[PDB]
Amino acid sequence: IDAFRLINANMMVLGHEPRQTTSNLGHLNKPSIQALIHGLNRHYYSITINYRKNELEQKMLLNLHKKSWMEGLTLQDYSEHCKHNESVVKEMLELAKNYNKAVEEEDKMTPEQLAIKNVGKQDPKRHLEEHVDVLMTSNIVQCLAAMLDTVVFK
Amino acid sequence: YLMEGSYNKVFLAKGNIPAESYTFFIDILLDTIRDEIAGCIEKAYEKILFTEATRILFFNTPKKMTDYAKKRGWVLGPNNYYSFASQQQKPEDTTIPSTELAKQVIEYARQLEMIV
């Protein structure tokens, strides 16, 4: 929101440096090179800003943006939770075979070479610990949410 | 012999007290048999006449059989030890697993996401 305002080209012809800095508040942000290509400091000047906040709006946006209504008190497709759980584990097996593949070129050429070299084909490591987290948070939430309703509902 | 189900052999050791009298101790050994099969008379004993479980312990027909048969069940009947066996009420609870286990799932999630 870099707001500006004109500086006098008359005073530019005078060669007189304007705006008489009396406070360490102006030269804090650094200007963009594209504005330096444009007028910037030959025709106008920069202005620092801030934002006026209160308490009253901050809460009524914070509590009013993304509030799930009763969603976690559901069961999430009770046939297909475990079926999707299969649908990750099945290729997680062969990705674990890649984890039985990628360990076996250690004690080899200088693992920065193992950093430049793994740029064409996927690693089992990061891809593995992805799916472990996905199955974990996929299962535990449905597990507990399945069990609150047995107490709360009779 | 008191460890395993050896019972009549214990009464044979009551037929063999070789060292001295040991009477003050074998009478507490009487009592510790009395509450023992006074307790484990309550098992899956489908029907027994007034002979077998009668004469295994000590007592044929005094009113000591009324003392046990009316202290506990196994009621005095037509030559009958009544096998009462319900064993039905206390199972089929999801709720106590839905309380303890709902505790344990949170106990998983504490040492799963939160750094310690």
Side-chain angles (χ1 to χ4, degrees):
Chain A
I1 209 62
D2 221 356
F4 306 111
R5 194 186 293 166
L6 181 68
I7 204 66
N8 207 168
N10 203 170
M11 190 176 287
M12 186 64 205
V13 171
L14 265 295
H16 185 275
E17 288 80 359
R19 294 183 52 77
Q20 52 98 26
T21 304
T22 60
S23 173
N24 200 162
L25 193 145
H27 299 284
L28 269 299
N29 291 319
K30 298 291 105 180
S32 71
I33 191 61
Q34 292 82 15
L36 192 59
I37 290 166
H38 298 86
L40 191 35
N41 256 156
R42 233 164 17 199
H43 298 73
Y44 27 103
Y45 59 85
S46 300
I47 305 167
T48 65
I49 66 163
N50 55 359
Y51 295 103
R52 292 182 64 86
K53 297 180 289 294
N54 55 359
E55 191 274 330
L56 192 146
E57 194 270 333
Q58 295 299 110
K59 191 265 176 188
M60 75 180 296
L61 189 144
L62 191 148
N63 202 6
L64 281 76
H65 191 264
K66 296 298 291 296
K67 301 285 104 177
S68 297
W69 183 254
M70 294 184 292
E71 180 66 29
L73 274 298
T74 58
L75 268 300
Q76 201 279 129
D77 195 0
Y78 186 76
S79 174
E80 295 292 322
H81 181 269
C82 297
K83 182 64 181 294
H84 184 272
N85 285 319
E86 178 67 31
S87 301
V88 178
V89 168
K90 187 178 262 78
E91 71 274 19
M92 183 267 176
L93 189 145
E94 184 62 34
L95 198 275
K97 181 63 180 293
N98 205 171
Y99 189 64
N100 203 3
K101 184 65 176 177
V103 179
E104 287 79 2
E105 66 271 17
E106 294 295 324
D107 193 74
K108 294 295 288 185
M109 192 72 197
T110 177
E112 57 87 22
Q113 185 63 42
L114 273 292
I116 191 174
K117 189 171 88 273
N118 290 111
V119 296
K121 73 279 192 188
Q122 60 90 33
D123 57 347
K125 184 73 176 295
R126 182 177 180 178
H127 192 195
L128 191 274
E129 63 186 1
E130 189 271 337
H131 290 291
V132 176
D133 195 5
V134 173
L135 290 171
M136 186 64 72
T137 59
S138 176
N139 287 315
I140 302 303
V141 176
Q142 194 276 126
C143 182
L144 197 278
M147 299 183 75
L148 293 181
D149 294 323
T150 59
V151 174
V152 176
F153 291 160
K154 184 69 178 177
Chain B
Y1 292 158
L2 268 72
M3 188 65 205
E4 68 263 8
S6 174
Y7 287 169
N8 301 115
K9 181 71 175 177
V10 176
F11 293 101
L12 294 175
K14 196 177 290 180
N16 192 2
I17 302 99
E20 58 262 16
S21 180
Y22 287 162
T23 300
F24 292 99
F25 301 163
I26 64 172
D27 295 333
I28 304 169
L29 186 144
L30 290 169
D31 196 5
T32 198
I33 289 169
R34 297 296 184 271
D35 58 356
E36 182 179 1
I37 302 99
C40 72
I41 196 64
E42 297 291 328
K43 293 191 176 300
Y45 295 167
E46 77 285 7
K47 181 175 74 173
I48 287 94
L49 76 162
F50 293 164
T51 300
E52 180 68 30
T54 292
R55 66 100 178 83
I56 55 171
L57 294 178
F58 183 73
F59 56 99
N60 44 6
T61 49
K63 298 289 104 178
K64 187 173 184 287
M65 71 181 290
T66 309
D67 195 5
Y68 292 109
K70 299 298 184 292
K71 184 260 293 178
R72 294 296 94 196
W74 300 98
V75 183
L76 186 65
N79 202 7
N80 191 358
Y81 288 157
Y82 291 98
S83 182
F84 63 97
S86 179
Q87 60 183 357
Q88 193 274 127
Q89 190 269 331
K90 76 279 191 188
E92 291 93 9
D93 48 347
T94 306
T95 302
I96 296 96
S98 184
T99 300
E100 295 179 354
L101 267 300
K103 184 67 70 177
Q104 292 179 0
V105 172
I106 304 170
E107 293 294 328
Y108 290 161
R110 291 180 68 252
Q111 55 179 358
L112 181 62
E113 181 68 29
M114 293 301 162
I115 190 64
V116 295

